[PDB]
Design a binder for this molecule. Structure first.
Ligand SMILES: *C(=O)[C@H](CCSC)NC=O
Ligand SMILES: [K+]
Ligand SMILES: [K+]
Ligand SMILES: [K+]
Ligand SMILES: [K+]
Ligand SMILES: [K+]
Ligand SMILES: [K+]
Ligand SMILES: [K+]
Ligand SMILES: [K+]
Ligand SMILES: [K+]
Ligand SMILES: [K+]
Ligand SMILES: [K+]
Ligand SMILES: [K+]
Ligand SMILES: [K+]
Ligand SMILES: [K+]
Ligand SMILES: [K+]
Ligand SMILES: [K+]
Ligand SMILES: [K+]
Ligand SMILES: [K+]
Ligand SMILES: [Mg+2]
Ligand SMILES: [Mg+2]
Ligand SMILES: [Mg+2]
Ligand SMILES: [Mg+2]
Ligand SMILES: [Mg+2]
Ligand SMILES: [Mg+2]
Ligand SMILES: [Mg+2]
Ligand SMILES: [Mg+2]
Ligand SMILES: [Mg+2]
Ligand SMILES: [Mg+2]
Ligand SMILES: [Mg+2]
Ligand SMILES: [Mg+2]
Ligand SMILES: [Mg+2]
Ligand SMILES: [Mg+2]
Ligand SMILES: [Mg+2]
Ligand SMILES: [Mg+2]
Ligand SMILES: [Mg+2]
Ligand SMILES: [Mg+2]
Ligand SMILES: [Mg+2]
Ligand SMILES: [Mg+2]
Ligand SMILES: [Mg+2]
Ligand SMILES: [Mg+2]
Ligand SMILES: [Mg+2]
Ligand SMILES: [Mg+2]
Ligand SMILES: [Mg+2]
Ligand SMILES: [Mg+2]
Ligand SMILES: [Mg+2]
Ligand SMILES: [Mg+2]
Ligand SMILES: [Mg+2]
Ligand SMILES: [Mg+2]
Ligand SMILES: [Mg+2]
Ligand SMILES: [Mg+2]
Ligand SMILES: [Mg+2]
Ligand SMILES: [Mg+2]
Ligand SMILES: [Mg+2]
Ligand SMILES: [Mg+2]
Ligand SMILES: [Mg+2]
Ligand SMILES: [Mg+2]
Ligand SMILES: [Mg+2]
Ligand SMILES: [Mg+2]
Ligand SMILES: [Mg+2]
Ligand SMILES: [Mg+2]
Ligand SMILES: [Mg+2]
Ligand SMILES: [Mg+2]
Ligand SMILES: [Mg+2]
Ligand SMILES: [Mg+2]
Ligand SMILES: [Mg+2]
Ligand SMILES: [Mg+2]
Ligand SMILES: [Mg+2]
Ligand SMILES: [Mg+2]
Ligand SMILES: [Mg+2]
Ligand SMILES: [Mg+2]
Ligand SMILES: [Mg+2]
Ligand SMILES: [Mg+2]
Ligand SMILES: [Mg+2]
Ligand SMILES: [Mg+2]
Ligand SMILES: [Mg+2]
Ligand SMILES: [Mg+2]
Ligand SMILES: [Mg+2]
Ligand SMILES: [Mg+2]
Ligand SMILES: [Mg+2]
Ligand SMILES: [Mg+2]
Ligand SMILES: [Mg+2]
Ligand SMILES: [Mg+2]
Ligand SMILES: [Mg+2]
Ligand SMILES: [Mg+2]
Ligand SMILES: [Mg+2]
Ligand SMILES: [Mg+2]
Ligand SMILES: [Mg+2]
Ligand SMILES: [Mg+2]
Ligand SMILES: [Mg+2]
Ligand SMILES: [Mg+2]
Ligand SMILES: [Mg+2]
Ligand SMILES: [Mg+2]
Ligand SMILES: [Mg+2]
Ligand SMILES: [Mg+2]
Ligand SMILES: [Mg+2]
Ligand SMILES: [Mg+2]
Ligand SMILES: [Mg+2]
Ligand SMILES: [Mg+2]
Ligand SMILES: [Mg+2]
Ligand SMILES: [Mg+2]
Ligand SMILES: [Mg+2]
Ligand SMILES: [Mg+2]
Ligand SMILES: [Mg+2]
Ligand SMILES: [Mg+2]
Ligand SMILES: [Mg+2]
Ligand SMILES: [Mg+2]
Ligand SMILES: [Mg+2]
Ligand SMILES: [Mg+2]
Ligand SMILES: [Mg+2]
Ligand SMILES: [Mg+2]
Ligand SMILES: [Mg+2]
Ligand SMILES: [Mg+2]
Ligand SMILES: [Mg+2]
Ligand SMILES: [Mg+2]
Ligand SMILES: [Mg+2]
Ligand SMILES: [Mg+2]
Ligand SMILES: [Mg+2]
Ligand SMILES: [Mg+2]
Ligand SMILES: [Mg+2]
Ligand SMILES: [Mg+2]
Ligand SMILES: [Mg+2]
Ligand SMILES: [Mg+2]
Ligand SMILES: [Mg+2]
Ligand SMILES: [Mg+2]
Ligand SMILES: [Mg+2]
Ligand SMILES: [Mg+2]
Ligand SMILES: [Mg+2]
Ligand SMILES: [Mg+2]
Ligand SMILES: [Mg+2]
Ligand SMILES: [Mg+2]
Ligand SMILES: [Mg+2]
Ligand SMILES: [Mg+2]
Ligand SMILES: [Mg+2]
Ligand SMILES: [Mg+2]
Ligand SMILES: [Mg+2]
Ligand SMILES: [Mg+2]
Ligand SMILES: [Mg+2]
Ligand SMILES: [Mg+2]
Ligand SMILES: [Mg+2]
Ligand SMILES: [Mg+2]
Ligand SMILES: [Mg+2]
Ligand SMILES: [Mg+2]
Ligand SMILES: [Mg+2]
Ligand SMILES: [Mg+2]
Ligand SMILES: [Mg+2]
Ligand SMILES: [Mg+2]
Ligand SMILES: [Mg+2]
Ligand SMILES: [Mg+2]
Ligand SMILES: [Mg+2]
Ligand SMILES: [Mg+2]
Ligand SMILES: [Mg+2]
Ligand SMILES: [Mg+2]
Ligand SMILES: [Mg+2]
Ligand SMILES: [Mg+2]
Ligand SMILES: [Mg+2]
Lengths: 112, 246, 29, 50
RNA sequence: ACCAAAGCUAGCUCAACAUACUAAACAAAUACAAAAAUACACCAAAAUAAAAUAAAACAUUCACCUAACAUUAAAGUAUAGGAGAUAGAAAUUUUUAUCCUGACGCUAUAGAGAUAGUACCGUAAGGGAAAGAUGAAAGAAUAAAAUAAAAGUAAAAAAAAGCAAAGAUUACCCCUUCUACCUUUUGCAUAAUGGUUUAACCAGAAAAAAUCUAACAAAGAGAACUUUAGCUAGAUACCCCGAAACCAGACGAGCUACCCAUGAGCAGUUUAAAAGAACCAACUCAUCUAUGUGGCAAAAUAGUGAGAAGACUUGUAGGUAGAGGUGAAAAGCCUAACGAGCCUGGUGAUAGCUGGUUGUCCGAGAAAGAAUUUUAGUUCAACCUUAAAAAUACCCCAAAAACCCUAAAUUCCAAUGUAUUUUUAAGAGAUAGUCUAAAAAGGUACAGCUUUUUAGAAACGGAUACAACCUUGACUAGAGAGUAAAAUCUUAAUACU
RNA sequence: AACAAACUCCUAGCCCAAUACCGGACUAAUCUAUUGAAACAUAGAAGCAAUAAUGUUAAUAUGAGUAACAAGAAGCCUUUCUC
RNA sequence: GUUUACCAAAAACAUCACCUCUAGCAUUACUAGUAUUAGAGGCAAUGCCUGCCCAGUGACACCAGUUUAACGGCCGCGGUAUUCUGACCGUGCAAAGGUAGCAUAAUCACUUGUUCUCCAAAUAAGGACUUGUAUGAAUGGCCACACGAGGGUUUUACUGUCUCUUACUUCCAAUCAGUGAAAUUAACCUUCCCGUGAAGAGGCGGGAAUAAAAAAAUAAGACGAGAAGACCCUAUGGAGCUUUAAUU
RNA sequence: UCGGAGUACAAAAAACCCUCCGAGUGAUUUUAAUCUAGACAAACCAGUCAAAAUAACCAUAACAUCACUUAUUGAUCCAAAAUUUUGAUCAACGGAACAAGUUACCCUAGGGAUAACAGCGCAAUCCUGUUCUAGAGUUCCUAUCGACAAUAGGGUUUACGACCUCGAUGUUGGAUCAGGACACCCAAAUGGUGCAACCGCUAUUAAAGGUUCGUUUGUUCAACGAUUAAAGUCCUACGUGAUCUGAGUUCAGACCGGAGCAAUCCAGGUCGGUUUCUAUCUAUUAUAAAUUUCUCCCAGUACGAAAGGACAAGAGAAAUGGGACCAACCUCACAAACGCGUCUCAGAGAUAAUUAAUGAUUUAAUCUUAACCUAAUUAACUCAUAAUAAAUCCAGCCCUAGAACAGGGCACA
């Protein structure tokens, strides 16, 4: 016969994890890019409009399992929390960046 | 060579052709980076570090006034009139260690370069040279062998009139009455005492200048230099004298 | 090449045949 | 080309020829070649087949 | 021992100088059908060159390509271009005379085509060769000297068995071991391509950026330019043969198509008939079959056939010429090939396509990701080669990477084992893949089938033969030794009174 | 057990395969600059090397002494016969 | 009568006849002519005929319009007389809806349509039946005399065509004497079988056979010799022809 | 061309004329600024995020939202608008500024990288045998058959793949000559039967020989007439064109129907249409020792209610095939050749399926991959037997011997 399926060809977007645990990253480096929320951002990690995670401070990347407390203004998420039984808590994965360099140091500039 | 194709038969396409695909040099929008580059003026930079270096080694001497011709004979700078070079600009790279006292004439100067020279008690003046005149000025001996009268130096174009008319740039066409007040402003700005140049024994040499219609020192338009006989020819007709002096 | 599952008792690689012959069952005597 | 390849085979062919002579001379005494060689090495007698 | 071999002149090439440039011969005859002494004439002419090609197609465009007055620079600059390919000035500058001219040019398949535009092939324009060797004397031919060396033959036919040889051997064979050589391919002893053999001849060429060596150095260069260690000079580089075609100008209607002139043929027989009537010769066509197929013949011979007073055959001579002529249209014929002649010039047309590519040895050594009138090709990335700089590369434990269920396992990383990797500067090839094991898909849970991902291989040993399976770190010599993969696989069965 | 490799030992070394592309060291034969003087050395230059293009020219073979070609007879020699 | 000189001589072209079209006229064609003339074409004597259609295109008029012997075209669906058939009727679209004739034809397929005659036996041939849903009227329909190196069938007569080959002559042929060519050729010391293999082996593997040469024969193989496959595809390779391709 | 899910199971990437969904934009207002660290992605061109800083406004205010939110899009040049800005089903979507058909009149360069013919691979299709019994067979599974299903093998058909050949592997049917297989049509032997006999159906064993002549079609095939013991199936480059044929396919001419405005096209028909080769090598160029049918007879017997009607055994005559020969007839103008004419044609061993005797494992029985002995029994095949036979005159002539070379005669002829 004849082919009915069309348009199935599309290259991958290379969605995945870029920096593993222990990698030393600087400010602005994209930790990971994703389609859906696979890894939630953590401490010192921003979140772009396309759900990509980028480090805000220079340091060591760490991955952690933590609890999930949704924003009350998010109607869909708060409804899911409402229907949970009393003994359960949501758990999600997070990406952290523990800072390495200190904020600054005091130096002698002038001795009057 | 290879095995078959356009490699072994030597008929591969031109340079920059990517096989039907639009080439890299044809998919970039046109913008003016070299628009009118053949008409932009160029100035060879001269640093005060090199100017001090020439004087210490005897390449040039401050006793005699220094202009573009003396720099070329000293192998300090090379000027190519063909490549739209309009002279030498003074830069301030070595202003801190400049201890010479000269009467230098250039085609462009900076605020710090002028201040550095005036600190020691020198004179800086900027003059414009047409490419027809600049070729003669940089290579005087070849010109004198062409058997032609010395022509008048042309005026700067409308674009370069303000630069050589203001007293801030020490323009050759500037009003001399505004030089002393402009000189003192630089002395006040950089905090150096302005020397009284009129009390130095070289005041006659330091005050030497050129007429705007004059090319060389002491020579006049219309003169023919017969180098073989070591004699200078001068015109006599009223029209010839008027044309070469107007 | 044939599929992993066929209808004709797929012939093993010769190295695998030796493995199937050295790992036989010998009843106690 | 045949000269070099045969030169490699020259050593093999002569070694094969020696074994046939050793086997022929060993069978004459009623002892096979495999029994004549291993039971001679066990006596620490290191004689090559040549 | 024949056939053969050897020789060094003939002359030529590229310049320079240079008179200033259709030679030599012209007694007679030469543009009547040239070389024929002699009668009322006509005579003469111009209209931009086009295209093959490049732009990977092709329409605007495409250097030189008829007419420039040169050289050093301005400059491959200003400008002109489906603004693509490529095309490209000027203003302004530089240049001292005569002699010193000859040859790191050839030596009879070279150099001009040349002993010669002659033989010879073409109606014509046109194409166009091979060919010489003794010595001081051949007025020294019972004459003399020289290599006796190419393929091919003779002296001298052959004796089982094999890519014609090697290992050898007292011995030519007999024995043992080896699937011609290049090209082209995933893979060729292949029954895929080319070559009978010999001699002669025949195919890599350019200096912008770069690397190596040297001069001088913040300056270099014997002007004109380049310069934040650069500038000047040297050395290191990129083939040959071949289309069908396209354009312009010549020469061809003595064959053939048609026509205009001028001539010449048709006997007998049958009919009031010279009626595109009838029988049958000369004569003209060529239906059918058989010989012939490098033939007698680049279209014929033998037999047999159709017309044979007409729209008929035929001689001489003239006319129409290729964007055309001519045609009772067969897309026929126009000098033995006409879907549009031949010759020369443009022309060394251009081919991603086929074939060819000439001494020895040594080092390292690649199977395909992305665009593309693109998949028969190119240009990038990866990989790799040469040189250089630098510090980290592989293996890599614990920790770590998603939400309903989910295998083999990947990513990332210290130690450790080991020397690799990155960067900079120059680069080409390749981009047409075959099988085995594993995870899948299409198919017939078919293919030596097809599309992807991971891994392997392309022995001179083993599976008798064998590209892909197994053993194997590919040097040379030895008549030494130890080993690896591996050589014949199992059963072949049932009395129940 | 044995027999069995480009593997690995043993004795000497010049001390490890290859297609496209790339790198290197040498070198046959010519001419020229200086040497050399029974045929060479160090250099500078190129028409610088042919077992392969249904390659060009010339000469040789094989096919093969094979395919195929021709003169009517006798005599007294040029005259009679047969077509 | 004519044509593809050199594979087609025919059913193709021409042709008398009929018809359409364009032109009122002078010094080189047509023509030393003047519409009963001369060109540009179609179709093919004769005989009986040549039906309907200017919507489209083209031409003329160059405006309405006029022209098909100009290019071309010349219909569905549903119901209806016991059954069958469908005179008729409903409804729709068109410029008109294939009229006369002939017909399983040289006429898509169905197809060896069905039937009769011919033969012992008929995918042949002739005569009928006939929607041929793709026949058809000067791109001509239909009928006939004469004619045909066209194509098909039947009877009669003859015969080596054949059942079934044979005898005898000449040119070839084979021996002797003379002259003496061509395609071809990697090297050959050039076997058979089974198996293997770039998938059909004189050459590999496992076995068999095996003194060496000459002459005369038959053509199974050497993927025999000959022509760089005419078929097929590819090439940003050509050319001829046509037009509603692009540019002009 | 662009996006999502599976193939691609756990970092990334990953294909098919693979399996399924979509996009070539709408709705709304929160109308979404300037400038810059660092990164993801990637051949390139493109695509994405983004802290700090500045301005905007709660006076220390930057993610436009929703529809699977992911895709909702286009490079230069060029053109138009104010200079801010815009412009393509350029969808062939990395895009030539603007270009269709046909070629069987075809040409050139190449490809077995790629088709038709042939081989090969494979077995969907096809063919052959077995396993399983529901049932058909009046009762009765398997005398003859056997649905739904199981399993093994053959390589004939149409396909599938595109692996060897396109610097050529010549292509249907006949003519000639046939080589081979057995899954046998006839001939021979035998088991079973819903086998009385006759005529049949079915199964086992055997391949030495044989398998007709005609009308139509180019035909293989098929139909029909006559006959035979029977008119087998298939392989062999669907054998065989360097042996022949060219009717058909399969060039150039020409009509008819149809498609196209045309050129031209049609596995639609019709008429016509060049079939080349001198044999180099391999291979090859005569032994025999028959086969079938019909008649008569047995016999109108056996067998059967009758109707019908045998086998074996005996005798004879023909046909084909093998090998020979002219007294006659016939071809016959040589003294020969020739057919249409004449002549001749064979014994023993040995077997397959099957049938029977004796007899043990199993003191019965039982033909025995139990022993000994023995019996009935297909065709091949083997052999008896027959043919061949003398080593060494050979110039010449003759010959029923012969291409040459050889061979037989030449004393009385
Ligand atoms: C099929 O017809 C083809 C020829 C085409 S040209 C007559 N066969 C080729 O072998
Ligand atoms: K071939
Ligand atoms: K080839
Ligand atoms: K070749
Ligand atoms: K003429
Ligand atoms: K002739
Ligand atoms: K290509
Ligand atoms: K005729
Ligand atoms: K009309
Ligand atoms: K009829
Ligand atoms: K005729
Ligand atoms: K043969
Ligand atoms: K495209
Ligand atoms: K198949
Ligand atoms: K072929
Ligand atoms: K048979
Ligand atoms: K042979
Ligand atoms: K006869
Ligand atoms: K028993
Ligand atoms: Mg993809
Ligand atoms: Mg996808
Ligand atoms: Mg090549
Ligand atoms: Mg290639
Ligand atoms: Mg394109
Ligand atoms: Mg400069
Ligand atoms: Mg596989
Ligand atoms: Mg072009
Ligand atoms: Mg090209
Ligand atoms: Mg031009
Ligand atoms: Mg313009
Ligand atoms: Mg010469
Ligand atoms: Mg020579
Ligand atoms: Mg010789
Ligand atoms: Mg041998
Ligand atoms: Mg091989
Ligand atoms: Mg191939
Ligand atoms: Mg290759
Ligand atoms: Mg070959
Ligand atoms: Mg080839
Ligand atoms: Mg050849
Ligand atoms: Mg350079
Ligand atoms: Mg052109
Ligand atoms: Mg022309
Ligand atoms: Mg004539
Ligand atoms: Mg007459
Ligand atoms: Mg007549
Ligand atoms: Mg004749
Ligand atoms: Mg004849
Ligand atoms: Mg005759
Ligand atoms: Mg006649
Ligand atoms: Mg007649
Ligand atoms: Mg002429
Ligand atoms: Mg014409
Ligand atoms: Mg004619
Ligand atoms: Mg025609
Ligand atoms: Mg035609
Ligand atoms: Mg010609
Ligand atoms: Mg070329
Ligand atoms: Mg590829
Ligand atoms: Mg690269
Ligand atoms: Mg770990
Ligand atoms: Mg590490
Ligand atoms: Mg490729
Ligand atoms: Mg593959
Ligand atoms: Mg495969
Ligand atoms: Mg791989
Ligand atoms: Mg081996
Ligand atoms: Mg080793
Ligand atoms: Mg060993
Ligand atoms: Mg190596
Ligand atoms: Mg390769
Ligand atoms: Mg040298
Ligand atoms: Mg050379
Ligand atoms: Mg040579
Ligand atoms: Mg040839
Ligand atoms: Mg050659
Ligand atoms: Mg010669
Ligand atoms: Mg000869
Ligand atoms: Mg011969
Ligand atoms: Mg002869
Ligand atoms: Mg006629
Ligand atoms: Mg003809
Ligand atoms: Mg004729
Ligand atoms: Mg003819
Ligand atoms: Mg009429
Ligand atoms: Mg008529
Ligand atoms: Mg006609
Ligand atoms: Mg007609
Ligand atoms: Mg009509
Ligand atoms: Mg009208
Ligand atoms: Mg009728
Ligand atoms: Mg009719
Ligand atoms: Mg029909
Ligand atoms: Mg017929
Ligand atoms: Mg007939
Ligand atoms: Mg009829
Ligand atoms: Mg019709
Ligand atoms: Mg009409
Ligand atoms: Mg018609
Ligand atoms: Mg008549
Ligand atoms: Mg007739
Ligand atoms: Mg008759
Ligand atoms: Mg002879
Ligand atoms: Mg032999
Ligand atoms: Mg074989
Ligand atoms: Mg062998
Ligand atoms: Mg063999
Ligand atoms: Mg002969
Ligand atoms: Mg012969
Ligand atoms: Mg061969
Ligand atoms: Mg053949
Ligand atoms: Mg051949
Ligand atoms: Mg070809
Ligand atoms: Mg074709
Ligand atoms: Mg293409
Ligand atoms: Mg083209
Ligand atoms: Mg062209
Ligand atoms: Mg043309
Ligand atoms: Mg148009
Ligand atoms: Mg990256
Ligand atoms: Mg901010
Ligand atoms: Mg462009
Ligand atoms: Mg594209
Ligand atoms: Mg893309
Ligand atoms: Mg372009
Ligand atoms: Mg035709
Ligand atoms: Mg061709
Ligand atoms: Mg391929
Ligand atoms: Mg064939
Ligand atoms: Mg096939
Ligand atoms: Mg084949
Ligand atoms: Mg099978
Ligand atoms: Mg029942
Ligand atoms: Mg099966
Ligand atoms: Mg293939
Ligand atoms: Mg394939
Ligand atoms: Mg060949
Ligand atoms: Mg036959
Ligand atoms: Mg047979
Ligand atoms: Mg049987
Ligand atoms: Mg029977
Ligand atoms: Mg055949
Ligand atoms: Mg045939
Ligand atoms: Mg023939
Ligand atoms: Mg043949
Ligand atoms: Mg025919
Ligand atoms: Mg027609
Ligand atoms: Mg005929
Ligand atoms: Mg025909
Ligand atoms: Mg022979
Ligand atoms: Mg023959
Ligand atoms: Mg009887
Ligand atoms: Mg007989
Ligand atoms: Mg008993
Ligand atoms: Mg015997
Ligand atoms: Mg005798």
């Amino acid at each position: 016969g004849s082919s009915k399926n069309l348009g199935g060809k599309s290259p991958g977007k290379r969605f995945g994890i870029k920096k593993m645990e222990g990698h030393y990253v600087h400010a602005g480096n994209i930790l990971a890019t994703q389609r859906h929320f696979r890894w939630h951002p953590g401490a010192h990690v921003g979140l772009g409009k396309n759900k990509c995670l980028y480090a805000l401070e220079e340091g060591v990347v760490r991955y952690t399992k933590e609890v999930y407390v949704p924003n009350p203004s998010n109607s869909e998420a708060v409804d899911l929390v409402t229907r949970l039984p009393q003994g359960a808590v949501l758990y999600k994965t997070f990406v952290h960046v523990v800072p390495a360099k200190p904020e600054g140091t005091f130096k002698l500039v002038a001795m009057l | 060579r290879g095995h078959k194709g356009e490699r072994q038969r030597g008929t591969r396409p031109r340079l920059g052709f990517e096989g039907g695909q639009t080439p890299f040099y044809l998919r970039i929008p046109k913008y003016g980076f070299n628009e009118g580059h053949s008409f932009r003026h160029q100035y060879q930079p001269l640093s005060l570090n090199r100017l001090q270096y020439l004087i210490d080694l005897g390449r040039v001497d401050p006793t005699q006034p220094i202009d573009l011709t003396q720099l070329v004979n000293g192998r300090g700078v090379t000027i190519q009139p063909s490549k739209r070079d309009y002279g030498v600009q003074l830069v301030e790279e070595g202003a801190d260690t400049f201890k010479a006292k000269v009467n230098i004439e250039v085609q462009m100067a900076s605020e710090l370069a002028i201040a550095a020279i005036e600190k020691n008690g020198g004179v800086v003046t900027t003059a414009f040279y047409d490419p027809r005149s600049l070729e003669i000025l940089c290579k005087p001996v070849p010109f004198f062998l062409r058997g032609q009268p010395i022509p008048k130096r042309m005026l700067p174009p409308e674009a370069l009139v303000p630069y050589y008319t203001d007293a801030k740039n020490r323009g050759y066409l500037a009003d001399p009455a505004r030089f002393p007040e402009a000189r003192l402003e630089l002395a006040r700005k950089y905090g150096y005492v302005l020397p009284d140049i009129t009390k130095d024994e070289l005041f006659k040499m330091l005050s030497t200048r050129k007429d705007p219609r004059q090319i060389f020192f002491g020579l006049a338009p219309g003169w023919v230099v017969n180098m073989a006989d070591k004699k200078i020819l001068k015109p006599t007709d009223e029209n010839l004298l008027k044309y070469y002096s107007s | 090449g044939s599929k992993a599952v066929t209808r004709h008792r797929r012939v093993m690689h010769f190295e695998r045949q030796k493995l199937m012959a050295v790992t036989e069952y010998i009843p106690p005597k | 080309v045949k000269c070099t390849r045969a030169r490699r085979l020259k050593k093999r062919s002569l070694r094969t020829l020696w074994i046939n002579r050793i086997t022929a001379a060993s069978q004459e005494h009623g002892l096979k070649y495999p029994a004549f060689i291993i039971n001679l090495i066990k006596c620490q007698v290191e004689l090559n087949r040549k």
